[PDB]
Design an enzyme around this catalytic site. Structure first.
Site, PDB file in Angstrom:
ATOM      1  N   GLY A   1     -15.354  -3.132   1.908  1.00 49.35           N
ATOM      2  CA  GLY A   1     -16.693  -2.553   1.866  1.00 49.35           C
ATOM      3  C   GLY A   1     -16.874  -1.494   0.791  1.00 49.35           C
ATOM      4  O   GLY A   1     -17.944  -1.409   0.180  1.00 49.35           O
TER       5      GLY A   1
ATOM      6  N   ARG B   1       0.814  -1.220   0.000  1.00 49.98           N
ATOM      7  CA  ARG B   1       0.000   0.000   0.000  1.00 49.98           C
ATOM      8  C   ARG B   1       0.854   1.281   0.000  1.00 49.98           C
ATOM      9  O   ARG B   1       0.373   2.314  -0.473  1.00 49.98           O
ATOM     10  CB  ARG B   1      -0.967   0.001   1.200  1.00 49.98           C
ATOM     11  CG  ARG B   1      -2.057  -1.064   1.095  1.00 49.98           C
ATOM     12  CD  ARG B   1      -3.049  -0.985   2.231  1.00 49.98           C
ATOM     13  NE  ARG B   1      -4.300  -1.667   1.889  1.00 49.98           N
ATOM     14  CZ  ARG B   1      -4.893  -2.586   2.646  1.00 49.98           C
ATOM     15  NH1 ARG B   1      -4.363  -2.940   3.812  1.00 49.98           N
ATOM     16  NH2 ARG B   1      -6.028  -3.147   2.252  1.00 49.98           N
TER      17      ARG B   1
ATOM     18  N   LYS C   1     -23.388 -16.453   1.938  1.00 49.52           N
ATOM     19  CA  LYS C   1     -24.784 -16.073   2.154  1.00 49.52           C
ATOM     20  C   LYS C   1     -25.361 -15.185   1.066  1.00 49.52           C
ATOM     21  O   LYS C   1     -24.702 -14.232   0.659  1.00 49.52           O
ATOM     22  CB  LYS C   1     -24.911 -15.286   3.482  1.00 49.52           C
ATOM     23  CG  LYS C   1     -24.603 -16.071   4.721  1.00 49.52           C
ATOM     24  CD  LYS C   1     -24.351 -15.173   5.889  1.00 49.52           C
ATOM     25  CE  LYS C   1     -24.347 -15.998   7.152  1.00 49.52           C
ATOM     26  NZ  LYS C   1     -24.027 -15.188   8.346  1.00 49.52           N
TER      27      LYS C   1
ATOM     28  N   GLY D   1     -11.802 -10.808  -0.831  1.00 51.17           N
ATOM     29  CA  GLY D   1     -10.697 -11.620  -0.353  1.00 51.17           C
ATOM     30  C   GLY D   1     -10.524 -13.003  -0.947  1.00 51.17           C
ATOM     31  O   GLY D   1      -9.411 -13.402  -1.265  1.00 51.17           O
TER      32      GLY D   1
HETATM   33  N1  LIG Z   1     -19.951 -24.552  -1.795  1.00 52.52           N
HETATM   34  C1  LIG Z   1     -19.531 -23.840  -0.710  1.00 52.52           C
HETATM   35  N2  LIG Z   1     -19.988 -24.129   0.535  1.00 52.52           N
HETATM   36  C2  LIG Z   1     -19.532 -23.500   1.642  1.00 52.52           C
HETATM   37  N3  LIG Z   1     -18.669 -22.462   1.611  1.00 52.52           N
HETATM   38  C3  LIG Z   1     -18.144 -22.043   0.430  1.00 52.52           C
HETATM   39  C4  LIG Z   1     -18.537 -22.736  -0.820  1.00 52.52           C
HETATM   40  N4  LIG Z   1     -17.882 -22.112  -1.816  1.00 52.52           N
HETATM   41  C5  LIG Z   1     -17.107 -21.150  -1.260  1.00 52.52           C
HETATM   42  N5  LIG Z   1     -17.290 -21.085   0.073  1.00 52.52           N
HETATM   43  C6  LIG Z   1     -16.588 -20.177   1.012  1.00 52.52           C
HETATM   44  O1  LIG Z   1     -17.434 -19.133   1.509  1.00 52.52           O
HETATM   45  C7  LIG Z   1     -16.671 -17.933   1.703  1.00 52.52           C
HETATM   46  C8  LIG Z   1     -17.317 -16.749   0.988  1.00 52.52           C
HETATM   47  O2  LIG Z   1     -17.826 -15.772   1.904  1.00 52.52           O
HETATM   48  P1  LIG Z   1     -17.697 -14.183   1.615  1.00 52.52           P
HETATM   49  O3  LIG Z   1     -16.852 -13.599   2.722  1.00 52.52           O
HETATM   50  O4  LIG Z   1     -19.084 -13.626   1.381  1.00 52.52           O
HETATM   51  O5  LIG Z   1     -16.863 -14.019   0.234  1.00 52.52           O
HETATM   52  P2  LIG Z   1     -16.270 -12.595  -0.292  1.00 52.52           P
HETATM   53  O6  LIG Z   1     -16.657 -11.573   0.751  1.00 52.52           O
HETATM   54  O7  LIG Z   1     -14.774 -12.770  -0.438  1.00 52.52           O
HETATM   55  O8  LIG Z   1     -16.942 -12.385  -1.623  1.00 52.52           O
HETATM   56  C9  LIG Z   1     -15.293 -18.203   1.115  1.00 52.52           C
HETATM   57  O9  LIG Z   1     -14.355 -18.424   2.173  1.00 52.52           O
HETATM   58  C10 LIG Z   1     -15.454 -19.471   0.297  1.00 52.52           C
HETATM   59  O10 LIG Z   1     -14.283 -20.297   0.249  1.00 52.52           O
END
Ligand SMILES: Nc1ncnc2c1ncn2[C@@H]1O[C@H](COP(=O)(O)OP(=O)(O)O)[C@@H](O)[C@H]1O
Length: 392
Positions: free
Chosen positions: A369, A36, A193, A346
């Site tokens: 965010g 950074r 989610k 991430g």
């Molecule tokens: N089929 C699955 N079932 C459960 N968890 C998963 C599946 N595929 C991916 N994940 C995990 O869920 C997490 C995604 O949550 P989130 O923090 O909303 O992603 P990001 O914010 O990086 O877009 C990741 O750590 C990912 O590896």
């Protein structure tokens, strides 16, 4: 274009305040990553060449406002910058009262988050910060979604407000994908989610031709299509919401390729073995941890046609080699696409590093965010004030 940039303002013999993102990891008073600090070098260099004095402002960690805390002091960051730049960097702890700088010199202010009124952007603190210079430059996108004295308030009272190198590029790369993308346009929204990505899903549903849902989000859509998910991660409460999303996508001619097949496991660990199953064959004891090879082929086909790609998440738990095929084939398709690709989040960044396709991605946002609020179609207070202050 709507806001002023560094090239549109007079920087000669002026005190130039710059809001940077020097929120770097620190361990035992030492920086563990300099990424950074290296990023804001062109912005600092440009001002210096124009004949102005640079005044750097930044946040670090999570200190309590109204108090000083040495474990969040920007002092090691000031020393780290002087090493990379090769130019002396004065560290100002009493910067609010006055700052003394002479063209060609760089000064590093102490962490902004220590000051009372910073988080709420008090006009009191905003006027005090604005009085310290002649021009304000905003170069910290990861904080542009927050209206704070050093990101937003200073721009209200300073005579000249503009955007720095990193911020101009971030807004430009994101707007090239959202405001007017070259068609076809494909978006990838993956995560645990539907709830945390609902606003992203509703905002993109209007602007894309292809909407690939992944992970926990996709599993909720599998349940909405009527298939049994067994012990898979999904949100039962949002099944009705995901059902509506599929209906609106049908009406707007959006391709949401719900997995035709999956990779299921009986244990959630890096030792579980994948079983390729059609979506309709998922048993109670099983959990979907990746997509199947037929679903990979469908995804690779659709991304090959796309001219713009917006990537926000994986399609499987790629941290497990036996369930990484889906995110590997997705990453390799994006790499082969040559489309203007914008990645953020991430997991997407970890997926990019694991499959070593970082170069083959046009832009990679390191914002959290701030990136998600922009993808939601929301107004970022720091950007809006610059638009207002750009009017002549
Ligand atoms: N089929 C699955 N079932 C459960 N968890 C998963 C599946 N595929 C991916 N994940 C995990 O869920 C997490 C995604 O949550 P989130 O923090 O909303 O992603 P990001 O914010 O990086 O877009 C990741 O750590 C990912 O590896």
């Amino acid at each position: 274009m709507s806001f002023l940039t560094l090239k549109d303002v007079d920087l000669k013999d002026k005190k130039v305040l710059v809001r940077v993102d020097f929120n770097v990891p620190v361990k035992d008073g030492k920086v563990t990553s300099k990424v950074r600090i290296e990023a804001a070098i062109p912005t600092i260099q440009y001002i210096l060449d124009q004949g102005g004095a640079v005044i750097l402002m930044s946040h670090l960690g999570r200190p309590t406002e109204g108090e000083y805390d040495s474990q969040f002091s920007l002092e090691p960051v000031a020393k780290a910058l002087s090493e990379i730049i090769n130019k002396p960097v004065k560290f100002a702890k009493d910067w609010l009262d006055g700052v003394d700088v002479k063209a060609g010199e760089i000064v590093m202010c102490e962490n902004v988050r220590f000051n009372s009124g910073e988080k709420k952007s008090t006009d009191d603190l905003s006027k005090k910060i604005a009085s310290l210079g002649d021009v304000f430059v905003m170069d910290a996108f990861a904080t542009a979604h927050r209206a704070q004295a050093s990101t937003y308030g200073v721009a209200k009272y300073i005579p000249v407000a503009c955007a720095g190198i990193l911020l101009t590029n971030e807004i430009q790369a994101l707007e090239k994908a959202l405001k007017s993308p070259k068609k076809p346009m494909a978006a990838i929204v993956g995560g645990s989610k539907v709830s945390t990505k609902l606003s992203v899903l509703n905002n993109l549903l209007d602007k894309v031709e292809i909407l690939i849902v992944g992970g926990g989000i996709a599993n909720t859509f599998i349940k909405a299509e009527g298939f049994d998910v067994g012990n898979s991660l999904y949100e039962q409460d949002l099944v009705a919401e995901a059902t509506e999303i599929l209906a609106k996508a049908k009406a707007l001619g959006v391709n949401i390729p719900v997995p035709v097949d999956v990779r299921v496991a009986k244990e959630f660990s890096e030792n579980a073995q994948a079983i390729i199953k059609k979506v309709s064959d998922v048993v109670a004891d099983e959990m979907i941890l990746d997509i199947g090879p037929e679903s990979q082929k469908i995804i690779a086909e659709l991304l090959k046609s796309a001219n713009t790609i917006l990537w926000n998440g994986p399609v499987g738990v790629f941290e497990f080699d036996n369930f990484a095929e889906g995110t590997k084939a997705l990453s390799l398709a994006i790499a082969q696409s040559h489309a203007f690709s914008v990645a953020g989040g991430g997991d997407t960044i970890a997926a990019i590093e694991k499959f070593g396709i970082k170069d083959q991605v046009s832009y990679i946002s390191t914002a959290g965010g701030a990136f998600l609020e922009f993808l939601e179609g929301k107004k970022l207070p720091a950007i809006e004030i610059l638009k207002e202050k750009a009017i002549r």
